[PDB]
């Protein structure tokens, strides 16, 4: 182990791997994440051979391009929990703009008051659709990093 950064192991086995570098971060001591800095791409195969021999039997390896699947699921959820907040803000800002014989006379007046709220500012809708467009952009980016994985 390197002391200054104990999360880095340097292999000193004097043949083919010498100068390989690995790091092991365990998480739910079932799952964990191995990262192999190797000196060419053969040496990364000879390592994944040597290892998948010495694991238990159902050990389900998988290459990661763009971060561990947990992290991507958060990063996906975040950009949906922002988007769907923004699409609520849309309808709420709209629903502020809509609010902004004797009995027969008052009856008809209050009926006319309730038939007034059929309409919504196109300009405001547009302001909000640009705020939303911005977050759709972030969500769709984070969905392509996931659907590759």
């Amino acid at each position: 182990i390197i002391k200054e950064f104990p999360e880095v192991y340097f292999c000193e086995r004097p043949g083919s791997f010498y100068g390989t570098l690995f790091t092991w971060k365990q998480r739910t001591p079932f799952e964990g994440i191995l990262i192999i800095y190797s000196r060419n791409q053969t040496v990364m195969f000879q390592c994944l051979h040597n290892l998948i021999r010495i694991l238990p039997i159902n050990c389900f390896l998988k290459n990661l391009k763009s971060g561990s699947e947990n992290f991507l699921i958060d990063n996906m959820a975040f950009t949906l929990e922002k988007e769907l907040v923004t699409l609520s803000s849309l309808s709420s800002a709209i629903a502020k703009h809509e609010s902004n014989p004797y009995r027969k006379e008052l009856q008809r007046e209050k009926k006319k008051m309730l038939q007034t709220n059929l309409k919504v500012s196109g300009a405001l809708y547009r302001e909000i659709t640009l705020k939303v467009a911005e977050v759709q952009l972030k969500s769709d980016f984070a969905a392509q990093k996931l659907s590759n994985l």
């Binding site: 629903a95 809509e98 014989p101 009995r103 027969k104 009856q107 008051m113 309730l114 709220n117």
Partner: protein, 118 residues
């Protein structure tokens, strides 16, 4: 304050009038049906006391609001079916018709229709 929020100017603005109509209809049935005491068919002299001006102005105001958000012939059909179906609180029904007749645009003739049927 309860009847104030019930007045559907703040609410009718925001709420689609599919579920809101069901809410008001259930509200009317739950006003009429609940505590069917004074079911005495001898509730004749008590019509004078259930006269519109003697019936509480709060009852009257709530009925006005329930008339605003709904239609007259819907209400008449609904009343015909409820009074045919299930027991009555006569206080609320008689106050209610007393407010109905004066509030809605000439539905004394729509009343006399189902009176003749009954």
């Amino acid at each position: 304050c309860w009847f104030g929020v019930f007045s559907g100017h703040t609410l009718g603005s925001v709420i689609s009038t599919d579920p809101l109509k069901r809410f008001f209809s259930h509200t009317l049935t739950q006003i009429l049906t609940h505590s069917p005491v004074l079911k005495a068919s001898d509730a004749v002299q008590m019509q004078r006391e259930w006269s519109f001006a003697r019936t509480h102005p709060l009852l009257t105001s709530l009925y006005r609001r329930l008339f605003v958000m709904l239609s007259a012939e819907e209400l008449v059909g609904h009343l015909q079916e409820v009074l045919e179906t299930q027991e009555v609180h006569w206080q609320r029904v008689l106050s209610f018709v007393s407010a109905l007749v004066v509030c809605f645009p000439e539905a004394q003739q729509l009343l006399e229709d189902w009176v003749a049927r009954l």
